[PDB]
Structure 1
Amino acid sequence: TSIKQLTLYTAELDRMLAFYTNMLGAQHVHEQADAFTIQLGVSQIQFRAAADGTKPFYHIAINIAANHFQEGKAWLSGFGELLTENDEDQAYFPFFNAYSCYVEDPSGNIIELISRQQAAPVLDKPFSADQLLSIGEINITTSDVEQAATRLKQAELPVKLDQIEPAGLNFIGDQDLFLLLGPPGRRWLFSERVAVIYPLQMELDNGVSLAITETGELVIL
């Protein structure tokens, strides 16, 4: 399955709109009075205003083609300084057989491009914003990992309940989409920001819709 729409919150709506309009182009962005949407291939994200006194952020990875990693990295670097971890400005993840690079948006969202070496197409054409494929990762930061995992499984996502670590990060998915399910508390790779519960909503292309509430409960809508 793929993410059809994600709804995220931001304390920086105006700066975010400018950032994504410049990055993706006006044809991939729609402004509303109280929100805006961006198109990432087959996935959409709506950003809405955060509650005053909060500064929500998320870990968002965007799938790019198997052969587009270095072009994607160069492109991404035009929009901010590439984030580094251990003084490296890219990463290889053997579990996903994937290369990743990262930049921060105006809210501190971790914007990752992920090039899955066997789980993405080879596209024989130049990379551009038009070649972003879909959302490949989103964090599901929850106050109850076991409950969340159980509800995701009841919703017919691939979940091996006996392997779930309630105090750790759990990769839930297959192919080109993984939910990063875990508790708050720990610093995110490539970021200064520590995992904190912020609300979101997610609609999958198979019709499944869910929310993370402001207290971190995963609820099936």
Structure 2
Amino acid sequence: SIKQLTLYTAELDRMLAFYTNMLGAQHVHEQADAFTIQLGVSQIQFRAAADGTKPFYHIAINIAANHFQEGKAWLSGFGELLTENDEDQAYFPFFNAYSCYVEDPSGNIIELISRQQAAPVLDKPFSADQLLSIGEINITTSDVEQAATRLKQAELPVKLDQIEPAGLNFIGDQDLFLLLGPPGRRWLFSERVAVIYPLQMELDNGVSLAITETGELVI
């Protein structure tokens, strides 16, 4: 799983307010020119973006198998649900998962994903305290093949011969997938096309990786 994720934002103030209101003060901590949010076992640190840039990403958050309708209702309280092909949710047969989406103040595409067999059934009400972990993050890179290769050299599940340098590649299994692909591809549920922005990531198993501002995945 993702222990720590570092992202950039050109809307630090609005983002801090947005997440404080969504998650509650007990999951959101203001720092110096940054703030953190805790999503179950995953933390995201949002740092101030460079001037002249407007970084955004696609982040999916795992929720329990039985929590989708409550999750969707909850998410809708924080912004208009995004739609694709006139639908305000998706079923993804490959993940056997239900998803819903909202845009945050930076234009991040924030998804709740409820994996129907790859997430637990929690017999309790859903709430902001029931977000389990980060289930997806985009790895938008200037070199998909290089990125896929290094991710394998990092001991992640990768089938190199299946990698599509011009398309989106699902890297992972169980409840975490890295969405590896090139810039230019429009994100489902969004008007925004994928753009390379820097980030850093620490997995629970100690592996550390980063995407530079020009799109190079490094370990």
Contact 2:56 2:107 in 1 (8 A): yes
Q: Deviations over 1:92-141 (max 9, x none)?
A: 00000000000000000000000000000000000001000000000000
3-state SS of paired residue (2:4): strand
Q: 1:73 deviation in Å?
A: 0.1
> 2: distance between equivalents of 1:194 and 1:167?
14
Q: Distance in 2 between matches of 1:122 and 1:47?
A: 30
Query: What are structure 2's unaligned runs of at least 5 residues?
Result: none
Alignment of 1:138-149 (within 5 A): 138-149=137-148
Q: Paired residue for 1:54? A: 53
Match of 1:189 in 2: 188
CA distance in 2, matches of 1:192, 1:112: 15
Task: Measure how far apart 1:142 and its partner are.
Answer: 0.1
Match of 1:67 in 2: 66
For the 8 Å contact 2:167–2:185, the answer to whether it is kept is no
Write out per-residue CA displacement over residues 39-91 of structure 1, whole angstroms, 9 at most, x where no aligned residue. 00000000000110000000000000000000000000000000000110000
Shift of 1:33: 1.9
Query: Any gaps of 5 or more consecutive residues in structure 1?
Result: none
C-alpha deviation, 1:186, in angstroms: 1.6
1:155-178 alpha-carbon deviations (Å, 9 max, x no partner): 000000010011110000000000
> Percent of counterpart pairs with the same letter?
100
**1:46, 1:112 → 2: CA distance?**
17
SS across alignment from 1:23: helix
Superposition TM-score, scaled by structure 2 size: 1.00
- Looking at structure 2, the residues matched to 32 and 188 of structure 1 have their Cα atoms a distance apart, in angstroms, of 30
Give the equivalent residue in structure 1 for 2:163: 164
Deviation beyond 2 Å, 4+ runs, structure 1:
none
Deviation at 1:205, TM superposition (A): 0.2
Distance 1:152 1:112 in 2: 24
In structure 2, how many angstroms separate the alpha carbons of the residues matched to 1:31 and 1:173?
31
Who is 2:26 aligned against?
27
Distance 1:47 1:33 in 2: 11
**Counterparts of 1:113 and 1:39 in 2: how far apart (Å)?**
15
What CA RMSD, in Å, does the superposition of the two structures yield over aligned residues?
0.4
Deviations along 1:5-62, whole A, 9 cap, x unmatched? Answer: 0000000000000000000000001101210000000000000001100000000000
1:6 is aligned to 2:10: no
TM-score normalised by length of structure 1: 0.99
* CA distance in 1 between partners of 2:24 and 2:164 (Å): 40
SS at match of 2:17: helix
3-state SS of paired residue (1:71)? helix
How far apart are the structure 1 equivalents of 2:36 and 2:137?
17
Q: After superposition, what is the alpha-carbon deviation per residue over 1:148-207, rounded to whole angstroms, capped at 9, x for unaligned? A: 000000000000001001111000000000000000002100001110000000000000
